[PDB]
Design a protein around this ligand. Structure first.
Ligand SMILES: [Cl-]
Ligand code: NA
Lengths: 1295, 48
RNA sequence: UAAUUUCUACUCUUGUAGAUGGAAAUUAGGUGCGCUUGGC
DNA sequence: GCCAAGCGCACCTAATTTCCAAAAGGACTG
DNA sequence: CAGTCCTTTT
C-alpha cells in the first residue's frame, strides 16, 4: 500500500544559499589595486540614478497607448455578474477567459495589433515595442519615436556609463515586460485595468444608482462636489458613473482625479478641506435623522481606484516644502524663535488672558468646534460643558418644554459660538480657575521653549527630543489661541479681536514648522547597502558551464573539505585568459569543478535549430529541407513539416496538450508528438554539446503521453558535474599574478572550533558535492549566482572588556531563566557597577547565577564591524522530479484513506495565546495540548508585545522605529520546528484556521514552505528526510491567491463554532440576541422553553428547550439534538487537579453603564441571582415545581428581563477577564454521564482553556474532512464545512 | 402601463366602472416626506 | 548583557540550538503624527 | 475620549511577478 | 574581413 516515506521527490524546489567570501593570499590586495570595489559601487550608483530616467520612456509610451483605448465593458460586467450569481466552475472559467479577452484587447494597443486604430499607428506602436526591453533604450532611437524631448548632458553621461555593460539591465527588462504583459499577473497594466480597477468602478456605478434612486437629492449634492473641485467639467455626474467613462479612467492622471472626486482636496494645514463624495455621504449619515437611516441601509462609500502601474502620483492637495539639512531646521527655527521674542508674542498673550479677568465676557466668544476640546482640557469629561450649557438653556425656555424645543436647543449648541460668560455661569467657578492654570502652564512651557537653546545638530535622539519638546510647547499655545472665535458673525470686543488675531498670525507658522521638523526628523538614518560585484565582467557568475568559464569568470574548487570560489577578473591591461591544466590526482592542489549543462531542452533545442534566423528566413520563401552543419558532427536536416510543427499559424502547436484539449484530434496530437520527439533525438545525437550523452534510458517516442513527460526524463541527463585536480603551483601562481581571485566559500560550520550540528544550508552544500549526488543528481547547482560587497555598518566598540564578566540568562539549573527585571541589575552588580543596593529578589538569585570571565575579546555585531564579501548561489532540490507536481492532493488522500489511524494536529490562533496546538488521535481524543507563547524557556509573546509598544512609543517620540519581523521570524522558526517534529513523529495531518472566514498568516507561509522541502538534520542523506531525499508534505506553493482548502497534509477549516462549543456535547448557544430586544420578544422567548424546575438533589436549575421551538430567535443551526437541558449550575466551590479552588457555574459578563457603556467586566453567579429573584417575588421553588409560568404570570418587566439576562449569561460558555487571566469554558448542559464541562477542573484529557478548546475543534473539523474522505468514492476532499454539517457531525458523535 | 377596460374581459370581474382606460404607474422607489416630516419610499408594496 | 551568510534564542564549548529563496521590479496595506468637517 | 469620512508626511510589512543560461547573434575594433 | 566579447534569445 502507500507509505509516508513515499512523499519525496515529487517536485523540484529552488533555494538560494548565502555565504561569506574570504579572499586568499594577494586577492584582496589585487582587488584594491585594480579599483574593482569602487567601480562596482559606482555602477550601482549610476543604475539607481539612470533608472527613473529610463522609466520616463515606459510611462510616456504606456499613457500614449492608454489614452487611445476605447472598449465596451458590458460583456465583462456580465461575466462578473454571472459568476457572482451562480458560483460555479463554469461561470468562473467564463470570467477568466473574458478577462483574458479584455487583457489582450488592452495589450493590442501596446504591440500595435488593435483593429481600433489606423494601420500606420499600429506600425509606430509595433516599432517602439520591439525596442523597449533591450539596448535600444540607451541609444535614443526609442525616444526619437516617442516625443520631441531630448536628453540632458548629465543624462547622456549616465547612458554612456553603461557602454558595453547594458546587460546589467537584464532583470530590469524582465521587470518591465512584467508591466506590459497580457498575462494574468499582478505586475501588469492590463491586469490592473481589467481585474483590479474595472470591478471597483463597476461597483461604484451600482452604488451611485442605488443612492440617487432612494434619495434623489444626493444627485445634486454630488454634482456640486464635482463643480467645487473643478474636475470632469464636460462630463455629467451620471456619465462619471457609467461604463463608457471607464475608458477615460486608465491613465494615472485621470485615476487621481476620480479619487479626488471621491476623497476631496486639502490645502495648508488649518485651512478648511474641500469635501469629496465619501465625506458628503458620511456627514449625511451622521445627522442621525430619518434620511440618514435610509442612506446608511444602502452602500454609502465609493471605492477609490488603484494606481496605474509605474505611473507617477499627482495630487491637487497642497504638499509641504521639505527640510534638507539638520542645519536648515535649526537655523530656520532659531530665526523664527528669535523673531517671536522680538515680536513679544508671549507678553501680548499673557495680557490677553488677563483681560478675561475684567473685560465683559459677553463679547468674548468660544468657537463651537472647540467646545469639546476645552471640556476635555479644563473639565472632568468631554461632554461636561455641552451638558452644562444644554441644561442651563432648556431651563430658560417658556411654556411646555416639548421634545421639539429640547431638540432645537441641542442643534443650537452645534451651530452658534458661545460667550465665556454663559460657559462660566453654566459650569462652576472651577472652570475659571482651571483656565488660569492651563493658561499659565502653556505660557510657562512656551517661555521655557523660547529661552532654551537649540542643539548643534540632530544626530542624537536627545537633540531631536529638544527640538520636538519646544515645538510641542509652541503648538500648545497655537491650540489655546485657536479656542477663540474671531469671526465677525458675533459681536466680539474689537480690540480683543484685533490683538488676538495679531498673535495668531505670528503663531501660525508653528504648525507648518511642527510638520516640517517631524517630516524631516523621523527620516530613516542612512545605511550602507550591499552592492553587486562584477569585477568588470558583464555576465559574472551567469552560468557555471565549462564552455562559458571564459565569459563568466566563475569557477569552484574543493581542497581538503573546504570550498573555494575562483573569480577571473578582466584587469587593467592585456593578459592572456587563464586556463587550467589537469594533472595526476596524486599531485597536491585543488579539485576544480567541471560543470556540463544543456539548459531546458524545450527552449534550447529550437533555439539552436528550428528558430535559427537562417532557417526562419529560408522557410519564408522555400519549401525544401535545410541542412545545418555548424555545431553538428553530422548534418541536421530540418523539413517544412518540422518547422511548421514548432512555428504554427496560431497557437497551440500540434504536440501540446491544449491542442488535444481543443481540436480533439488525439490521432493528430500523437502523430506530431512522435515527429517532434524524434526530431529532438536527431538533434541531440548531432549537436556538439549533447552528441556524447548517453540517451539510452529514454523510451521510444510513441510511448510518451505528453511532451512534459518526455522533457522530465530527458533534462536530468543533460546535466553533469565532475572534478579534476589542478596543481597547487598553477593556482597559487595565478593568485600571485592576479589572473585569479580566490575566495574561501565560508560560513561558521567551517570554523576551526566548529564541533556541533551544521546549518541545514551547509547540509545542502556538502550534499550537493557528495559522491552519491555526483553519481545521481538529487541537488543541482544553478547559475545566476551573485557576489556582493557589504561595507561595515556598526562601529567596532568591543562588548567585552578584558576585566568584565558576562552573565548567563539562565541559572545554574541551565533551565530556569533570570527574570527580565533582574537581569540588568545583576549584570551591573557582578561587574561592580551598581550605583545602589541590590534588589532583595536579585540578592536571592545571586548565589545561583553563572558569570564568565572574558578570556578573549568578542565584539557585538562583529560581522558588521568589517567590510565583507558575500556570495549567493541558487540550487535546485529534487532535480529528478518535474518542475510541478501532478495531482499532489490525490496522492495524499489515497495515503489517508489507506491510513485511518492518522492523528491530527489542530493549530489555533488564540485570544490569550499567539499559537495553541492540540493533537488528537483518530478516535477524537487529545494526545497533547499546549500554548506556544513560551518556547525554549523564552516568552515570545511578552517580547513581541513589548517590542510593538516600543515601536509605537518610538513613532510618537520621533526616535528610530526599527523592525519586528526579525523577532517574529525568530519565534515562528521555533514554532515551525516543533510542528514539523510533531508531524513526523505522529505522521499527522495539520489543520489550520481559514483566515477568509499577523503571526498566524506569517506562520502559514513559513509552515507551507518548510513542508515543500523538509530535511531533518539528524537523518542520513540516503534516508527519506535526508538531504538527498527531502520530504514533501505540502503542495507546491505558488501564491496565496491560488491556494485551496487542502495543501497536501495541510488542511484549512472554518473558524466558527470551534471555541464557543462544549467539548463533551457539541452544544452551542443557539440564539441571536439581536432578535431579543423588546418586552414582547423577551416574553415569547421565555414561552419557548417547556419548563424551569429546581433539582433539590444537585441544587442546579434545569431549563428545558426543545430545538424544534422558538425558531424565530435561532441562528438556523438545529444541529443533531432535539432538546437540551440547560443547567444553572449551583454556585459551589470545586477544586482543580493542582488543588486550586474555583466557583462552579460562574460567569464573567461586561459591566454596563446606562444605555451602552462597557469598559470593565464583573463576576456573575446565575444560580444564586435566580434564587435572589425568586425569593424577592416569594415564588416557591424547592418543591421541584415549574417556575416559568409563575415568572410571567403577572408580566413583571424586571422579572422576565432579569431572567433573559441570566439565561443568556448561562449560555455564555466562554468567560474571560484579562485582568486575572481567566479564559475558561463552562458548559450549560450536562453530557451523557451527567457532567457539565468545566475547563477549570484542568483535566488533561480535555481542553484546559478556551483557546485549547479552539485548537481541539479545529483538529476535529479536520477529522470531519478525513471521515468524509474514507466514505467518499473519490480522492477529492469536500470544499468547506457548513456550520450545520459541523454541528450535526460533532453532536451525533458525542450523544 | 396603459390598460383599456374593454380588454382582458376574461380576467375581469364584469365591473367596467366609468373610465374606459387607466394609466397604471410603477412609481420610482424614491424617498418622500409626510406632513410630520417622516419619510417613506414611494410605490412600496408589502407582499405575502 | 557577547561571537552568526543572515535571523531568533543561547554560552559546557574561540562558539551552541533551531530556522533561513536570493536578486530585481511593482503594487497593496498598516502603525504614528498633523490637519478638515462632522457624531456621540 | 473615543469614533466617522478624508487629505499630507515619516517608516514598516507583505504579496506577487521575472530570472536562476548556453549559445545564437551581431556590434565593435584593428 | 576575422576575431572578440557584449547582447539577446529559445
Ligand atoms: Cl467560536
Ligand atoms: Na552549530
Amino acid at each position: 500500500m502507500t507509505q509516508f516515506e513515499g512523499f519525496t521527490n515529487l517536485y523540484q524546489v529552488s533555494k538560494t544559499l548565502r555565504f561569506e567570501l574570504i579572499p586568499q593570499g594577494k586577492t584582496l590586495k589585487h582587488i584594491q589595486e585594480q579599483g574593482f570595489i569602487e567601480e562596482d559601487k559606482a555602477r550601482n550608483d549610476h543604475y539607481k540614478e539612470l533608472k527613473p530616467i529610463i522609466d520616463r520612456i515606459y510611462k510616456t509610451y504606456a499613457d500614449q497607448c492608454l489614452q487611445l483605448v476605447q472598449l465596451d465593458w458590458e460583456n465583462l460586467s456580465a461575466a462578473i455578474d454571472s459568476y457572482r450569481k451562480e458560483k460555479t466552475e463554469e461561470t468562473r472559467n467564463a470570467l477568466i477567459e473574458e478577462q483574458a479577452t479584455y487583457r489582450n484587447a488592452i495589450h493590442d494597443y501596446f504591440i500595435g495589433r488593435t483593429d481600433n486604430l489606423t494601420d500606420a499607428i499600429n506600425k509606430r506602436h509595433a516599432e517602439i515595442y520591439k525596442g523597449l526591453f533591450k539596448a535600444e533604450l540607451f541609444n535614443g532611437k526609442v525616444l526619437k519615436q516617442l516625443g520631441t524631448v531630448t536628453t540632458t548632458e548629465h543624462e547622456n553621461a549616465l547612458l554612456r556609463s553603461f557602454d558595453k555593460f547594458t546587460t546589467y539591465f537584464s532583470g530590469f527588462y524582465e521587470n518591465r515586460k512584467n508591466v506590459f504583459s497580457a498575462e494574468d499577473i499582478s505586475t501588469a497594466i492590463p491586469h490592473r485595468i481589467v481585474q483590479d480597477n474595472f470591478p471597483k468602478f463597476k461597483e461604484n456605478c451600482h452604488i451611485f444608482t442605488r443612492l440617487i434612486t432612494a434619495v434623489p437629492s444626493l444627485r445634486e449634492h454630488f454634482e456640486n462636489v464635482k463643480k467645487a473641485i473643478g474636475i470632469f467639467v464636460s462630463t455629467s455626474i451620471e456619465e462619471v458613473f457609467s461604463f463608457p467613462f471607464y475608458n477615460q479612467l486608465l491613465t494615472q492622471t485621470q485615476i487621481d482625479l476620480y479619487n479626488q472626486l471621491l476623497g476631496g482636496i486639502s490645502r495648508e494645514a488649518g485651512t478648511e478641506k474641500i469635501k469629496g463624495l465619501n465625506e458628503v455621504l458620511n456627514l449625511a449619515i451622521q445627522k442621525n435623522d430619518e434620511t440618514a437611516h435610509i442612506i446608511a441601509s444602502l452602500p454609502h462609500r465609493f471605492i477609490p481606484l488603484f494606481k496605474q502601474i509605474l505611473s507617477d502620483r499627482n495630487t491637487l492637495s497642497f504638499i509641504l516644502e521639505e527640510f534638507k539639512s539638520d542645519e536648515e531646521v535649526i537655523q530656520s527655527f532659531c530665526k523664527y524663535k528669535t523673531l517671536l521674542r522680538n515680536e513679544n508674542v508671549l507678553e501680548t498673550a499673557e495680557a490677553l488672558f488677563n483681560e478675561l479677568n475684567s473685560i465683559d465676557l459677553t463679547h468674548i466668544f468660544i468657537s463651537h468646534k472647540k467646545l469639546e476640546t476645552i471640556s476635555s482640557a479644563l473639565c472632568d469629561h468631554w461632554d461636561t460643558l455641552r451638558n452644562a450649557l444644554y441644561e442651563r438653556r432648556i431651563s430658560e425656555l417658556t411654556g411646555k418644554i416639548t421634545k421639539s424645543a429640547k431638540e432645537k436647543v441641542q442643534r443650537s449648541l452645534k451651530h452658534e459660538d458661545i460667550n465665556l460668560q454663559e460657559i462660566i455661569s453654566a459650569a462652576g467657578k472651577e472652570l475659571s480657575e482651571a483656565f488660569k492654570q492651563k493658561t499659565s502652564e502653556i505660557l510657562s512651557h512656551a517661555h521655557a521653549a523660547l529661552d532654551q537653546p537649540l542643539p548643534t545638530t540632530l544626530k542624537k535622539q536627545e537633540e531631536k527630543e529638544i527640538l520636538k519638546s519646544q515645538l510641542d510647547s509652541l503648538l500648545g499655545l497655537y491650540h489655546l489661541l485657536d479656542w477663540f472665535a474671531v469671526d465677525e458673525s458675533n459681536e466680539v470686543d474689537p480690540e480683543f479681536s484685533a490683538r488676538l488675531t495679531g498673535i495668531k498670525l505670528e503663531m501660525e507658522p508653528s504648525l507648518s514648522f511642527y510638520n516640517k521638523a517631524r517630516n524631516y526628523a523621523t527620516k530613516k538614518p542612512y545605511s550602507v547597502e550591499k552592492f553587486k560585484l562584477n569585477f568588470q565582467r558583464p555576465t559574472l557568475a551567469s552560468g557555471w558551464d565549462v564552455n562559458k568559464e571564459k565569459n563568466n569568470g566563475a569557477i569552484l574548487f574543493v581542497k581538503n573539505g573546504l570550498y573555494y570560489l575562483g573569480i577571473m577578473p578582466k584587469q587593467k591591461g592585456r593578459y592572456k585568459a587563464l586556463s587550467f591544466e589537469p594533472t595526476e590526482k596524486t599531485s597536491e592542489g585543488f579539485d576544480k569543478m567541471y560543470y556540463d549543462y544543456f539548459p531546458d531542452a524545450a527552449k534550447m533545442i529550437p533555439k539552436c535549430s528550428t528558430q535559427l534566423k537562417a532557417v526562419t528566413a529560408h522557410f519564408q520563401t522555400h519549401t525544401t529541407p535545410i541542412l545545418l552543419s555548424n555545431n553538428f558532427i553530422e548534418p541536421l536536416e530540418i523539413t517544412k513539416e518540422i518547422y511548421d510543427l514548432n512555428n504554427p499559424e496560431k497557437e497551440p502547436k500540434k504536440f501540446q496538450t491544449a491542442y488535444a484539449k481543443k481540436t480533439g484530434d488525439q490521432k493528430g496530437y500523437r502523430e506530431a508528438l512522435c515527429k517532434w520527439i524524434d526530431f529532438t533525438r536527431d538533434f541531440l545525437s548531432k549537436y556538439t554539446k549533447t552528441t556524447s550523452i548517453d540517451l539510452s534510458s529514454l523510451r521510444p517516442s510513441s510511448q510518451y503521453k505528453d511532451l512534459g513527460e518526455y522533457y522530465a526524463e530527458l533534462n536530468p541527463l543533460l546535466y553533469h558535474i565532475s572534478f579534476q585536480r589542478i596543481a597547487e603551483k598553477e593556482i597559487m601562481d595565478a593568485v600571485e599574478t592576479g589572473k585569479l581571485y580566490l575566495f574561501q566559500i565560508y560560513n561558521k560550520d567551517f570554523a576551526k572550533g566548529h564541533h556541533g550540528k551544521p546549518n541545514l544550508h551547509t547540509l545542502y552544500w556538502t550534499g550537493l558535492f557528495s559522491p552519491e549526488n555526483l553519481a545521481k543528481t538529487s541537488i543541482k547547482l544553478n547559475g545566476q549566482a551573485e557576489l556582493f560587497y557589504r561595507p561595515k555598518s556598526r562601529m567596532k566598540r568591543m562588548a567585552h572588556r578584558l576585566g568584565e564578566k558576562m552573565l548567563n540568562k539562565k541559572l545554574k539549573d541551565q533551565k530556569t531563566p533570570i527574570p527580565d527585571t533582574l537581569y540588568q541589575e545583576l549584570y551591573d552588580y557582578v561587574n561592580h557597577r551598581l550605583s545602589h543596593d541590590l534588589s532583595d529578589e536579585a540578592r536571592a538569585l545571586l548565589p545561583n547565577v553563572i558569570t564568565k570571565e572574558v578570556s578573549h575579546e568578542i565584539i557585538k555585531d562583529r560581522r558588521f564591524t568589517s567590510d565583507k564579501f558575500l556570495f549567493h548561489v541558487p540550487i535546485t532540490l529534487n532535480y529528478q522530479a518535474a518542475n510541478s507536481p501532478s495531482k499532489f492532493n490525490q496522492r495524499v488522500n489515497a495515503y489517508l484513506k489507506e491510513h485511518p489511524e492518522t492523528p491530527i494536529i489542530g493549530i489555533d490562533r488564540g485570544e490569550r495565546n499567539l499559537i495553541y496546538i492540540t493533537v488528537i488521535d483518530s478516535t477524537g481524543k487529545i494526545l497533547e495540548q499546549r500554548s506556544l507563547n513560551t518556547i525554549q524557556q523564552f516568552d515570545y509573546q511578552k517580547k513581541l508585545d513589548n517590542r510593538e509598544k516600543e515601536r509605537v512609543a518610538a513613532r510618537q517620540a520621533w526616535s528610530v522605529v526599527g523592525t519586528i519581523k526579525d523577532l517574529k521570524q525568530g519565534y515562528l522558526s521555533q514554532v515551525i520546528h516543533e510542528i514539523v517534529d510533531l508531524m513526523i513523529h505522529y505522521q499527522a495531518v495539520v489543520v489550520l484556521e481559514n483566515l477568509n472566514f499577523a503571526v498566524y498568516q506569517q506562520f502559514e507561509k513559513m509552515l507551507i514552505d518548510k513542508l515543500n522541502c523538509l530535511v531533518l538534520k539528524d537523518y542520513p542523506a540516503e534516508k527519506v528526510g535526508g538531504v538527498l531525499n527531502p520530504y514533501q508534505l505540502t503542495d507546491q506553493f505558488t501564491s496565496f491567491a491560488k491556494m485551496g482548502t487542502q495543501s497536501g497534509f495541510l488542511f484549512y477549516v472554518p473558524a466558527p463554532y470551534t471555541s464557543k462549543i462544549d467539548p463533551l456535547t457539541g452544544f452551542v448557544d443557539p440564539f441571536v440576541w439581536k432578535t431579543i430586544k423588546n418586552h414582547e420578544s423577551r416574553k415569547h422567548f421565555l414561552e419557548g422553553f417547556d419548563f424551569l424546575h429546581y433539582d433539590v438533589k444537585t441544587g442546579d436549575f434545569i431549563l428545558h428547550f426543545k430545538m424544534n421551538r422558538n425558531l424565530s430567535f435561532q441562528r438556523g443551526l438545529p444541529g443533531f439534538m432535539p432538546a437540551w437541558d440547560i443547567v444553572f449550575e449551583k454556585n459551589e466551590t470545586q477544586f482543580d487537579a493542582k488543588g486550586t479552588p474555583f466557583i462552579a457555574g460562574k460567569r464573567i459578563v461586561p459591566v454596563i453603564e446606562n444605555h451602552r457603556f462597557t469598559g470593565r467586566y464583573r463576576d456573575l453567579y446565575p444560580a444564586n441571582e435566580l434564587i435572589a429573584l425568586l425569593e424577592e417575588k416569594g415564588i416557591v421553588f424547592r418543591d421541584g415545581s415549574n417556575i416559568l409560568p409563575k415568572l410571567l404570570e403577572n408580566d413583571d418587566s424586571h422579572a422576565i428581563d432579569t431572567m433573559v439576562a441570566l439565561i443568556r449569561s448561562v449560555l455564555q460558555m466562554r468567560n474571560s477577564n484579562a485582568a486575572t487571566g481567566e479564559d475558561y469554558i463552562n458548559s450549560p448542559v450536562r453530557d451523557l454521564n451527567g457532567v457539565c464541562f468545566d475547563s477549570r477542573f484542568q483535566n488533561p484529557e480535555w481542553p484546559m482553556d478556551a483557546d485549547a478548546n479552539g485548537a481541539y475543534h479545529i483538529a476535529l473539523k479536520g477529522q470531519l474532512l478525513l471521515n468524509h474522505l474514507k466514505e467518499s468514492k473519490d480522492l477529492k476532499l469536500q470544499n468547506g464545512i457548513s456550520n450545520q454539517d459541523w454541528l450535526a457531525y460533532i453532536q451525533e458523535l458525542r450523544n
